[PDB]
């Protein structure tokens, strides 16, 4: 019953080739709901889930203004950081920002986040107390002194404990028919002879939501991880996820093996046997 909202911003400098690329995406749980791209034609925050389309023009105008202002901050900050590090103007660099909040089953605030990277490594992060910062290096110490002077933590905390939680609650109610529903995995087994002496068994989980799942293999009832393979959970493209697990077995011995599937949408864990 706990839920999250997250925004992910990325800015990439393009020396010699114009202003930086800026992309913003928002998620509730595992569901993307909004996007912005500096290189798209609309110049507007855009909907990516059905339940956000109901928001009125003032919502879209404000969201657009906010991400455009961050894109301009990031442009400036790419130059500022280049200067802190004494880097060449010829190189492409990246700023990434994540922020958002977690609520419990009663809708109450659990915690907030604001963390920033430069070139794919930690730069500065708001600590869990929402009242202090961790700087990863001497350049980020400059930014930390600037943000301490500016009372930036108080600004972040006011959003994270306030607006962030209130809008996440709103989205969970408006989007309840999908955000608060589980889609259990559709499961099956396939079999793939390698030679006369060995075969692969593959246990599939398809079409599930949310992304969290466990697939395990057993031999005569005992967990087996030797000679198994688990692929990274992958998006289907339609808002659901996929995963499989495979084991190589001696030919003739397939029926010794079982796969177990655990997911929040299952009334009971599933067992599959060839």
């Amino acid at each position: 019953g706990s839920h999250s909202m997250r925004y992910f911003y990325t800015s990439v400098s393009r020396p010699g080739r114009g202003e930086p690329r800026f992309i913003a995406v928002g998620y509730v749980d595992d569901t993307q709901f909004v996007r912005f791209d500096s290189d798209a034609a609309s110049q507007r925050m855009e909907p990516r889930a059905p339940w956000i389309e109901q928001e009125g023009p003032e919502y879209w105008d404000q969201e657009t203004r906010n991400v455009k202002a961050q894109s301009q901050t990031d442009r400036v900050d790419l130059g500022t950081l280049r200067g802190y590090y004494n880097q060449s103007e010829d190189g492409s660099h990246t700023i990434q920002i994540m922020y958002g909040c977690d609520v419990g089953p009663d809708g109450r605030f659990l915690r907030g986040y604001r963390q920033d990277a430069y070139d794919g490594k930690d730069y500065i992060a708001l600590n869990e107390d929402l009242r202090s910062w961790t700087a990863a290096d001497m350049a980020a110490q400059i930014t930390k002194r600037k943000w301490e002077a500016a009372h930036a933590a108080e600004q972040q905390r006011a959003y994270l404990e306030g607006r962030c939680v209130e809008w996440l609650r709103r989205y969970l109610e408006n989007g309840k028919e999908t955000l608060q529903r589980t889609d259990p995995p559709k499961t099956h087994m396939t079999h793939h002879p390698i030679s006369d002496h060995e075969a692969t068994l593959r246990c599939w989980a398809l079409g599930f939501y949310p992304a969290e799942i466990t697939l395990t293999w057993q031999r005569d009832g005992e967990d087996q991880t030797q000679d198994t393979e688990l692929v990274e959970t992958r998006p289907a493209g339609d808002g659901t996820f996929q995963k499989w697990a495979a084991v190589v077995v001696p030919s003739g011995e397939e029926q010794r093996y079982t796969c177990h599937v655990q997911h929040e949408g299952l009334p009971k864990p599933l067992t599959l046997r060839w």
Binding site: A69, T143, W147, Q155
Partner: peptide, 9 residues
Amino acid sequence: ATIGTAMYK
């Protein structure tokens, strides 16, 4: 909904 403040570094 996004945060309104943008923090320069």
